[PDB]
Amino acid sequence: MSSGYPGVSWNKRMCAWLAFFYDGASRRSRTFHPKHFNMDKEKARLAAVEFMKTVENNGRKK
Amino acid sequence: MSSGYPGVSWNKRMCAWLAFFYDGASRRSRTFHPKHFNMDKEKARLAAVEFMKTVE
DNA sequence: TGCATGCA
DNA sequence: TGCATGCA
DNA sequence: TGCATGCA
DNA sequence: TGCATGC
């Protein structure tokens, strides 16, 4: 499994684990995003843009 | 682009920003994962499992 | 979005 | 079921 | 794995 | 030009 636990699976589009459970007869899910995903994704974006700016030239690179 | 910026794009399978650039003739790329992705994904996994046991 | 439902 | 999908 | 080709 | 895909 992706999780190694019954009912818990990684949703690739969402980048989150959903826990699927029965509520009486009704199948339901609860979403668990990696902690601080938004913060850390945004910080990764800034870091990537910063690097991109370093390499916005026509000379040979490091 | 998926970032706000030219040359930087989100790779979905990788769950990471890629910066595409030119080293003269060659096209290159550098990868940028969210800083503590592996650890925080694991924390989220353990929380999903905890919910599973509790809600069951 | 997070979620409930669809797919196989 | 694990996980992708449609929803406005 | 991270990277750079493939495709438009 | 962005970004999925194959190694």
CATH number at residue A20: 1.20.5.2050
Method of determination used here: X-ray
Quickly tell me which residue has 């990788």 as its tokens.
Answer: B14
Q: Which of residues 16-55 of A touch B (CB under 8 A)?
A: 16-19, 21, 30, 32-37, 40-41, 43-45, 47-49, 51-52, 55
| Amino acid at residue number A16 | A
Question: Phi/psi of residue B39, each to 5°?
Answer: -65, -40
What Å distances lie between residue A47 and A3, A36, B31, B39, CA to CA? Answer: 30, 16, 10, 19
- Asked whether B52 and A21 are in contact (CB, 8 A), the reply is yes
Q: Which chain A residues are within 8 Å of B3, Cβ to Cβ?
A: 45, 48-49
Domain tally for chain B? 1
Q: Long-range contacts made by residues A27-32, C-beta under 8 angstroms, separation at least 24?
A: A30/B48, A30/B51, A30/B55, A32/B44, A32/B45, A32/B47, A32/B48, A32/B51
User: Which structural domain range is residue A32 located in?
Assistant: 1-62
Kind plus residue range of the DSSP H or E element containing A59:
none
Whether the Cβ atoms of residue A16 and residue A34 lie closer than 8 Å to each other: yes
Resolution of the model in angstroms: 2.2
Q: What is the rounded distance in angstroms from the CA atom of residue A55 to the CA atom of residue A58?
A: 8
